[PDB]
Design a protein around this ligand. Structure first.
Ligand SMILES: COc1cc2cc(OC)c1OC[C@H](O)[C@@H](O)CCOC(=O)[C@@H]1CCCCN1C(=O)[C@H]2C1CCCCC1
Length: 128
């Protein structure tokens, strides 16, 4: 499946190279620009727990997920992984707990020490 493909062929995009955030680009975007910290970012996403017990998509809310990059409003792995994307790009991220909800989890939504998977599409980003 998609998460196993990410384990085996995905790029380690963490600074510490501890494989905590792995990425495959699944649809290439356009332009050279990727978002800077502080930029307003609009995405669609699907996500799941590696235990298969919970799934979440922006399309449920019928509308883009909007957030300010690097402003600690999402998990570390998103600040790291969305910053690497181009406008129009679809990527797959597989994320160890240290870059998500940690040992404590976000009980009981996110269990303790959960690995997470997302499919993210970067729709647009604007200057603060
Ligand atoms: C722990 O709580 C949540 C987790 C997620 C979705 C939630 O609501 C839509 C949610 O509760 C509201 C909270 O406001 C979130 O924003 C926290 C930040 O969320 C993120 O940082 C990450 C990345 C941005 C998209 C949402 N995502 C999540 O962790 C989802 C998870 C994904 C795994 C499967 C369960 C939902």
């Amino acid at each position: 499946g998609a998460p196993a493909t990410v384990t085996e062929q995905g790029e380690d995009i963490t600074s510490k190279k501890d494989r905590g955030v792995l990425k495959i680009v699944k649809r290439v975007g356009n332009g050279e620009e990727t978002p800077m910290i502080g930029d307003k970012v609009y995405v669609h996403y699907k996500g799941k727990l590696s235990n298969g017990k919970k799934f979440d998509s922006s399309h449920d809310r019928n509308e883009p997920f909007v957030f300010s990059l690097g402003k600690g409003q999402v998990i570390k792995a998103w600040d790291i992984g969305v910053a690497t994307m181009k406008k129009g790009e679809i990527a797959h991220l597989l994320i160890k707990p240290e870059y998500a909800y940690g040992s404590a989890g976000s009980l009981p939504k996110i269990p303790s020490n959960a690995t997470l998977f997302f499919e993210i599409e970067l729709l647009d980003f604007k200057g603060e």
